[PDB]
Structures are given as C-alpha cells and as structure tokens.
Amino acid sequence: PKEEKFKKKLEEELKKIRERLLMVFDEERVEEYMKIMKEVIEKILENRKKGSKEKVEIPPGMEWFYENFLRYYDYEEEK
C-alpha cells in the first residue's frame, strides 16, 4: 500500500545517491557504501516495525545518516 510507495521512493532516492557518488569516488567505495547504507536502513526499519524504542547499533560515521533517515521516515509516515 503506502509502504510499497515508500519502498519505491526510497529505492529511487538510493539510485540517485549512487549516481551522484560515482561522480566523486571509485565504484568499489561507492557500492560498498551503498551496501552499508542499505544495512543501516534495514536495521532501522526492522526496529520500527516491532514498535521498539531501542537504538540499533550503527557503524562508525553513519550516525548522521541514522538521524536523517529517522526524520525522513517520520516525514513519510506523516505524508
């Protein structure tokens, strides 16, 4: 339903992220970073689906993305 549209929009955002990163770094680092981000996303979504308030373990450097994706998801559950 709305969560399918959410997943589609998120995948489109990720495609744009990859395409812009390829303009700055090499494909190995870009794709590895995409993998890291998707792992973080899946942890966050799994945590929220159980109504949990416990913070998930975030690899170093991805705390900014943790907060920003929390805000992003909350905006998209409002909308």
Partner: protein
C-alpha cells in the same frame, strides 16, 4: 534599582525600534564567503570547496528584549547585561551555494534556518550619566537547519555540505552579523 532597570529597558527598546526600521537589518546582506573543506564520514572522504554568494538574513525585525535587564552595582558604577532575541520567529538565511567535490560542481539555492537567534550585550554606566556599551556578540546558534535544493536528506553530499555550512555559520556568518549589529546598537545606546 527599578529606576535603573526601567531606564535601561527604555533605552534598549528605543534602540531596537530604531534598528528594526533600518533596511540594513531586514534583509541583512552578508559578505560572500568561500572555503575548502575536508570531512571523513566512514569510508567516504570528501575533499572539496564551496562558495556562498548573495547571502541574506531575514527575521531580525522581530528582535525583542528577553527578560529584565541584568543590573549590577559595582564600585559606584552601574553594569548591565542584556539579551535581545527573536523567539516566535526564525532567522532565515538564503544564499546561492556553488560546491565542488571531484567531478561534481553543482550550484544550488540554500535556505538555512536559525532557531532561537539571540544577541548578548553588556553596558557600563557611570551612575550620574551616559551609557557605554562595553560588550556585544551574537550568540552561538542553537541549531542551523540547512535546506539544500536538489539533494535528498539521505544524500552523503547533503550531510557533508550541511556540516560544513553549519560550521561556517557558527564562525563567519556570526561574526559578520556582529559587525553589522554592534555599531548600530552602539549609536542608539550611547546617544
């Protein structure tokens, strides 16, 4: 002490009212800035440059004195500390950002929102007459929220530019806003 506090508040509100009716305050032009930045986020290491042009601050016309004037009596001299703020409004900066990271060299309009923008000043008054402003500074911004066009909130480029612009605001923008706000307040308070 109530007479002193009232006279200080009266002078400060007259000052603020004269300041708010100046076209230099809202909108306030900020000198153009450019910097180089290096930020290491996990495996990603961003080394780039950015240039902010046409910087404009809006929302300073809602400046109001916050709390009673802090009056101190030391050695027969009146010494006051005061806070003048824009709560119930946000100070908003709009500018054009041109950044360069590797091959990517985009140019986007950015809107940064300062929450709880407030300035602090310190007056020295010989108890007989005349006001002297001895200190003046714009406070460290509690939070600078950046809205960069073209970038998602998830984009690493957004996080990097957000961090760099926030640091630039906590340094360059704060000082250049102080350079405009201090002399006008000095004029109104010491006249």
């Amino acid at each position: 002490y109530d007479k002193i506090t009232e006279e200080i508040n009266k002078a400060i509100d007259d000052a603020i009212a004269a300041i708010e009716q100046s076209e230099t305050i809202d909108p306030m032009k900020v000198p153009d800035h450019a910097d180089k930045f290096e930020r290491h986020v996990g495996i990603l290491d961003f080394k780039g440059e950015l240039a902010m042009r046409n910087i404009e601050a809006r929302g300073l016309k809602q400046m109001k004195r916050q709390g009673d004037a802090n009056v101190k009596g030391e050695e027969g001299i009146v010494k006051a500390h005061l806070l003048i703020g824009v709560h119930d409004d946000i100070v908003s900066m709009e500018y054009d950002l041109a950044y360069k990271l590797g091959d990517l060299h985009p140019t986007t309009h950015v809107i940064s929102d300062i929450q709880d923008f407030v300035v602090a000043l310190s007056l020295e008054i010989p108890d007989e007459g005349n006001i002297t402003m001895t200190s003046f500074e714009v406070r460290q911004f509690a939070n600078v929220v950046n809205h960069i066009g073209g970038l998602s909130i998830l984009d690493p480029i957004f996080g990097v530019l957000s961090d760099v612009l926030t640091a630039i605001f906590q340094d360059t923008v704060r000082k250049e806003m102080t350079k405009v706000l201090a002399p006008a307040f000095k004029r109104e308070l010491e006249k």
